[PDB]
Each structure stands twice: as C-alpha cells, then as structure tokens.
Design a protein around this ligand. Structure first.
Ligand SMILES: Cc1c([C@@H](C)Nc2nc3c(c4cc(=O)n(C5CCOCC5)cc24)CNCC3)cccc1C(F)(F)F
Length: 477
C-alpha cells in the first residue's frame, strides 16, 4: 500500500519513538492531537491523507520557527509532495510489453486515496503560509522564488484551483510591499472634540505632561497603543523572539510595543522625580492619576497598568510626602488600578471579560505568560533514546497568542491629533542612559527629593512657570 522508507520518509510507521499524542480528549474523534513528534511526523500529520486538520495548520504555521526554518519547511513540504508511485504488477508489465494499457488497479487506487489527498493538503499548507505568514517570503526572496517555482510547476486538473488561489495571494501580497497603511477603522459612537490646555494648538515646543490636556494625553496614548497592540503578529512571540539574538529583525512590532511601554512608564517616573519641589510633584502625580482615570474610562488597560508600573516603581513608590497630599479619591483610583494585578491578575481578567469594545488589553501579562510557558516546558520530550519536538508547548504559546488576537479588531471612536501623536511616539526619557542605570539614577533622584527618615526633607525651588491646576477629567460637553 504505502511507499517504503528508502524512497519516502513520511511513510515510516507511528511509534513512541516518533510521535506522542494527547490522551486528554479525543475518544476516537477521528483526528488525534499530537503532544510531540519528529518534524517528519509533524509534517506528515499536517498533510495527512485521511483528514484535513486546519487547527493544526494554523498552530503549526504560527509556531514552526521554534523548531524549523522557512527554507527547511519548504523543503519538507515539497518532499511530502513528491510521493513515489508503485511499479506495475507482473501482469501489467506483460500488458505494457504487449502494447496494451495496464489495468493499473493499485496505482489508480494509490493516486486517488493517497497521493491526491497529501498533495492537496500540501497546497492547503502553502496557501495558509502565503496568506497569514507572508513575512517569511518578504524577509526571503529566495524562499519566494522556491515557492513560486514549486507552485508553478504543479501539474494536474485537481491542483489547478489551489495553484491559482496561491498565486493570487502571492501577487496580492507583492502589491502590499509598496502600499502600506490605510484608513479602515471600526468606529461607531460620535467622537469628542480634541481637548486643549496650556499648550496652544500646534505649538509643539510647549508640549509637556502638565501642558497638554490630561484627557487628550490619555486619548492620544490610547490611539497609539491601540495601533501598537494591533500591529503585533502572533509569530513574533513564539520562542520569546524579543529575547533572542534576532529580536530587531523578527520581533519588529513586538519590540515597538515593548519599547513604548518602557518609554512611557519611565517618562512618568522621570516627570515625577525630576520635579524636586514637593507641591509641584503632587501636581505631577495627580495629573498622571487623572490620565489613569481617562485610561480606565476608555478601557485602555495597558495604559492603566503602565501607570501602576510607574507608581509602584522604586523611585516613585517611596515618595510618601507626595502621596500624602494626593487626595483620597485619587488614592482609591490607584488602589483599584493596583487591584487589577492582585491575585495573578484576577480582577483584570474579570473586568476585561465583562467590558464592551473598544479596549486595549494589558500587553505585559501575555509576555509574562509566554515566558512562564517557555521556561516551564521542555523543547524536546525524550522517548526511547530519541528526542521528539514538544508540540504541546507550541500549542500552549499559540493559544496565548489567540487570546491577544481576539482584541486586535476594535479601534476607537477618538480623533487623532497628529502632533500629540508624534510627540508621544518620540518619547525617550532615558536618552543616552540605559534602563537599569537610568532607574538607579531615578532612585538616587528620589532619595534626593525625599530623603530617608532621619534626614529631613529640604525645600526645593519651582520649575513650572505656569498654572498647575488641572482642567479635569470631565470633557467640554
Ligand atoms: C495605591 C498606591 C499605589 C499602588 C499602585 N500600589 C499598591 N497598591 C495597593 C497594594 C500594593 C501592594 C504592593 O505590594 N505594592 C508594591 C508592588 C511592587 O512594587 C512596589 C509596591 C503596591 C501596592 C495592596 N492593596 C491595596 C492597594 C502606589 C503608590 C501610591 C498609592 C497610594 F496609596 F498613595 F494611592
């Protein structure tokens, strides 16, 4: 029936030396769930003759980079396509030598019941690859040449529509190379006016924390973070690519999210500790809590928990004389914001699963859970002396990426202000410093502005030449 191992590797039999399945679920579901296997066995079951497996295709193509390179994958699926057909029977040879057509009964069967199935499943994998994962081919024009040489040498009536589907996707993605962004945008309620404060509209030189409006700070950062959140692809997280040695190649949108998070959070800390006058620093902290209010009103959980991160920082959290003068209202607001994180993020996930769109989810819990998954599961399971790729680990990370992805569909009914947007895109509080040494700077600055117990607090001069009373978090209705 099936071909032999000396001509075709994807016809080696299943064993505990080559595949492990999950026994959780599946009491003869038809399709088993692979816990682990060799890459050959994974590719085989990705392109199986008995069944299509679209959930495995998606999960595989999101994650394969943790176990297999693009060029290796393309070689493997092409090898899977190249099935050896059987030789004729002795009677069919006799028919051929007589000048007649052979009956060809097993060959006709094997084509219909093995080859065609596997080959159409290979094309299904290729089609999913060029649609949802085209960045591999954007990063590798030789990979694209190989794919297009493959797809354009496929022969057969049965393969025609798949080849045409794949090539239309490849051509459409080639247009995307020079096109880029556009306006789409699911937005439904009426948007507000842009709110303005000490900064006169367009006078970018004047823009600061206390001079832009706190509602508008929150709304433009929410617009920004919504776009940053929505730009991260699933595959950028698998293997923790942001902490591999090709991060700035292969985590482009992910590092932009991470760096924004760092720059805004350290900018809040910087704003606080470099205001050495206590009374001004209360105004700073109070304004950041008002930005947190508007983040809470917008359901930008990412912006809430960035302020939580700044206020719980070593430099800021010890500034007891500042927080003593923050009113009980704003203290309750920070307490409730901290409570989002308490008990493993219990209140966060309960709130997130009960609010209505739009939102920006907190991004850093997903990174944390992916790292816990990465550090807590082996890359290979050992069986019988052989090492099998832990695909259950990859499925676990892929599941977490889908919990991100379900919220990437929901932009805001907020008006963009392009100068405030560009201002916040260009935050760099550290400058030429690095994070650790900058936060040690900020901690030393904290100890300057509020010294420790038996050294009394000195009086420092003002730095703001402008009114420090906020306009408030209520809009100009
Ligand atoms: C509420 C607040 C906060 C918020 C954001 N922090 C915190 N708020 C609560 C609890 C916390 C426990 C804790 O272990 N941490 C630490 C986390 C690791 O980093 C070092 C701090 C921080 C906490 C316990 N439950 C009650 C609410 C920051 C500054 C000023 C104020 C205000 F009270 F003045 F408003």
């Amino acid at each position: 029936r099936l071909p032999s191992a000396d001509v075709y590797r994807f016809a080696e039999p299943d064993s505990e030396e080559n595949i492990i399945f999950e026994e959780n679920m599946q009491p003869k579901a038809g399709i088993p769930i692979i816990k682990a296997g060799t890459v050959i066995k994974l590719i085989e079951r990705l392109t199986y003759h008995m069944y299509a497996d679209p959930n495995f295709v998606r999960t595989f193509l999101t994650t394969y980079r943790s176990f297999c390179k693009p060029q290796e994958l393309l070689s493997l699926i092409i090898e899977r396509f190249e099935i050896p057909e059987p030789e004729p029977t002795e009677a069919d040879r006799i028919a051929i030598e007589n000048g007649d057509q052979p009956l060809s009964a097993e060959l006709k069967r094997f084509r219909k019941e093995y080859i065609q199935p596997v080959q159409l499943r290979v094309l299904n994998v290729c089609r999913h690859w060029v649609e949802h994962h085209f960045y591999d081919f954007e990063r590798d024009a030789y990979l694209l040449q190989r794919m297009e040489e493959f797809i354009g040498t496929v022969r057969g009536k049965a393969m025609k529509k798949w080849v045409e589907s794949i090539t239309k996707i490849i051509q459409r993605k080639k247009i995307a190379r020079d096109n880029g962004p556009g306006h789409n945008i699911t937005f439904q309620s009426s948007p507000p006016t842009v709110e303005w404060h000490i900064s006169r509209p367009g006078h970018i030189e004047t823009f600061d924390l206390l001079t832009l409006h706190p509602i508008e700070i929150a709304r433009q950062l929410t617009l920004l973070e919504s776009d940053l959140y929505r730009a991260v692809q699933p595959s950028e997280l698998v293997g923790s690519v942001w902490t591999k040695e090709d991060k700035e190649i292969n985590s482009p949108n992910l590092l932009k999210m991470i760096r924004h998070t760092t720059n805004l959070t350290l900018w809040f800390e910087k704003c606080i500790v470099e205001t050495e006058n206590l009374e001004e620093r209360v105004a700073v902290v109070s304004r950041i809590i008002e930005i947190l209010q508007v983040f809470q009103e917008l359901n930008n959980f990412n912006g809430v928990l960035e302020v939580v991160s700044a206020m719980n920082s070593s430099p800021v959290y010890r500034l007891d004389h500042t927080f003593e003068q923050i009113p009980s209202r704003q203290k309750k607001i920070l307490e409730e914001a901290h409570e989002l994180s308490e008990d493993h993020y219990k209140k966060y996930l309960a709130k997130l699963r009960s609010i209505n769109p739009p939102c920006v989810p907190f991004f850093g819990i997903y990174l944390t859970n992916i790292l816990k998954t990465e550090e807590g599961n082996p890359e290979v399971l050992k069986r019988h002396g052989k090492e099998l790729i832990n695909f259950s680990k990859r499925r676990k990370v892929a599941e977490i990426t889908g919990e991100i992805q379900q919220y990437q569909n929901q932009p805001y009914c907020l008006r963009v202000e392009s100068d405030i947007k560009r201002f916040f895109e260009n935050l760099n509080p550290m400058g030429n410093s690095m994070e650790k040494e900058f936060t040690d700077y900020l901690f030393n600055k904290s100890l300057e502005i509020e010294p420790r117990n038996p050294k009394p607090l000195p009086r420092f001069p003002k730095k703001y030449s402008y009114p420090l009373k906020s306009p408030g978090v209520r809009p100009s209705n």
